[PDB]
Design a protein around this ligand. Structure first.
Ligand SMILES: [Zn+2]
Ligand SMILES: [Zn+2]
Ligand SMILES: [Zn+2]
Length: 606
């Protein structure tokens, strides 16, 4: 006979881009129980109550199955209760349901019952921790001195997993405690996949996403038995090792300095009143060549208490009206659906349809009606250009005061949203976290909604989606999954960050369906937004004190997207600052610029 047993190892750890740890495996001293196939329930009760002399059990919360187990532990009682009923394993379960768990146990009794439950829970030949009230150093060394009196019992060392205080703590996630073994919701997934029931696993964010990587490789043994089933031999099969480590793409120092910037700007805008009803401000920076996440920062402003709190996860979980940043995706949809040809000229004019208020741009009537190319539409943030484009996806040509036919409305809204999805606006980003919001995208809508969607006043998107969108433009239409993890690494001698096992490779999701020369038109528009010399140029704030050439688009909402350097992009950034009523200066582009300059300082680009 041979019975094989699996024990757990140490979890791999999480490091920022410069090698600073984000978590900690901390060593404790613990009462351990190693169970033998030969211990009766009575042998367990004798061990539990010898142990109670040495430990403290103050908070005893017994489940009725635990109470029925302890009760049945008496051999005679177990017989008598089966005798009294209407496959041994089936009869245990049957006898179990038969006893009224309103038995009478003194409070001291309850404590041995608690201890028993702990011992009983341990598999044959397995080793599990016996939870007790914390043990000081002397209490421990008395147990160490008489533990030989108690079969199976010994002192040894275990782990707690701790998250260090850092600006990336929210994103690290948590791990299940030794006490609360596996999560019960997924209990079946994990036993199946291979795990034991007391395993410590990732339950949120990175710890969960990279659980397969972080989980220690287990020691495995086979115990050899004599003809009676008595342990004879301990033959090992696999020796265990610490889990592997992941190194993030984010540098703490960079992330810290973005957090400070957002906090600096948001308080200023509260200072002058512009941010009074704003829910907060969010920024995500990405490397457009690889999808690497440079930082994901968020500051939440509570509209009831006024309090400000860090909200990095807001970047992947909360949604916002995106405003005018999205105008390049609408033009793209115009090219895809045969509405627009190259850098086509349209008339900028108010758009007047039967049944709705006339549509204007930020400049209203100030320059009358005038011709405008696709580049200039982006430069000026023309609503006329994109509203005429959308009507054209619906198969129609604009004439003032037209009654609009809606037979092609669903078809049209689908084509628009499909292009938007090509840029990650309204679709999954691919980011390496368990659960991202994919936006607020209403399945019920009318014609006015379709039209407003075209200039970014209908569907709501997350800040991560808005970064992937500008990064896609910056990477010439090849949209890349954002990834917070940079590589998986081995452990070194001492157990810290060792050497590269495997880098996380760049992942292409799709290629936007527009020609190379169309994409060059978008690039010229974003460039003129920040370099133009018209009274209608919207984005010169991008270039004001810019240390590299910046291209971008401006966004009630003060949103902004940008990349740099223009000629060879190494950073793409989205800034989302909702319901800022400041009409005298727009801080969106200035935040975007200052994040770009911060990065250039930190990782020179040129
Ligand atoms: Zn034997
Ligand atoms: Zn809003
Ligand atoms: Zn730096």
């Amino acid at each position: 006979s041979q019975t094989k047993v699996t024990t757990s190892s140490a979890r791999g750890e999480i490091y920022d881009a410069s090698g600073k740890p984000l978590v900690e495996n901390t060593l404790k001293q613990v009462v351990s129980f190693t169970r033998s196939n030969k211990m009766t329930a009575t042998d367990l009760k004798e061990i539990a109550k010898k142990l109670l002399t040495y430990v403290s059990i103050s908070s005893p919360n017994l489940t009725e199955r635990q109470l029925a187990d302890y009760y049945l532990a008496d051999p005679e009682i177990y017989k008598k209760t089966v005798e009294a009923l209407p496959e041994s394993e089936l009869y245990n379960n049957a006898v179990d349901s038969v006893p009224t768990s309103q038995l009478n146990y003194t409070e001291d009794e309850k404590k041995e019952i608690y201890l028993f439950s702990q011992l009983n829970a341990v598999g044959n030949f397995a080793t599990g921790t016996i939870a007790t009230d914390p043990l000081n150093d002397s209490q421990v060394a008395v147990i160490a001195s008489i533990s030989k009196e108690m079969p199976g019992i010994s002192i040894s060392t275990s782990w707690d997993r701790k998250i260090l205080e850092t600006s990336l703590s929210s994103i690290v996630g948590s791990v299940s405690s030794e006490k609360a073994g596996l999560p019960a919701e997924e209990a079946e997934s994990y036993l199946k996949k291979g795990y034991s029931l007391n395993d410590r696993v990732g339950t949120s964010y990175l710890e969960k996403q990279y659980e397969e990587v972080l989980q220690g490789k287990r020691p495995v043994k086979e115990i050899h038995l004599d003809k009676h089933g008595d342990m004879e031999s301990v033959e090992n099969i696999e020796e265990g090792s610490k889990g592997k480590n992941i190194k993030l793409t984010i540098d703490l120092a960079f992330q810290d300095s973005v957090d400070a910037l957002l906090k600096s700007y948001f308080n200023s805008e509260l200072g002058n009143g512009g941010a009074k009803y704003s829910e907060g401000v969010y920024a995500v920076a990405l490397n457009p060549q690889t999808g690497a996440v440079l930082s994901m920062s968020g500051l939440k402003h509570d509209l009831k208490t006024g309090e400000l709190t860090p909200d990095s996860l807001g970047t992947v979980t909360n949604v916002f009206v995106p405003g005018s940043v999205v105008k390049a995706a609408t033009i793209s949809s115009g090219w895809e659906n045969g509405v627009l040809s190259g850098n086509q000229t349209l008339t900028d004019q108010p758009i007047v349809f039967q049944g709705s208020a006339p549509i204007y741009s930020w400049y209203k009537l100030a320059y009358g009606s005038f011709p405008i190319t696709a580049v200039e539409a982006l430069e000026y943030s023309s609503n006329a250009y994109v509203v005429q484009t959308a009507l054209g996806i619906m198969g129609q040509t604009y004439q003032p005061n037209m009654f609009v036919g809606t037979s092609n409305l669903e078809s049209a809204m689908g084509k628009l949203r499909s292009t938007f999805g090509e840029y990650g606006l309204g679709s999954a980003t691919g980011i390496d976290l368990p659960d991202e919001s994919t936006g607020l995208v209403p399945k019920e809508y009318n014609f006015a909604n379709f039209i407003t969607n075209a200039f970014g006043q209908f569907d709501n998107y997350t800040p991560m989606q808005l970064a992937q969108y500008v990064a896609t433009i910056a990477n010439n239409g090849v949209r890349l999954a954002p990834h917070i993890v940079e590589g998986i690494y081995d452990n070194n001698d001492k157990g810290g960050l060792g050497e590269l096992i495997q880098a996380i490779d760049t992942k292409e999701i799709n290629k936007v369906n527009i020609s190379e020369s169309d994409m060059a038109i978008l690039h010229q528009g974003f460039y003129q937004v920040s370099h133009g010399t018209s009274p209608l140029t919207t984005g010169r704030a991008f270039s004001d004190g810019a240390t590299v050439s910046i291209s971008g688009k401006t966004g009630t909402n003060t949103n902004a997207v940008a990349y740099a350097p223009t000629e060879n992009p190494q950073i793409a950034v989205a800034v989302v600052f909702p319901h800022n009523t400041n009409l005298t200066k727009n801080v969106g582009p200035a935040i975007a610029r200052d994040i770009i300059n911060l990065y250039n300082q930190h990782h020179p680009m040129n």
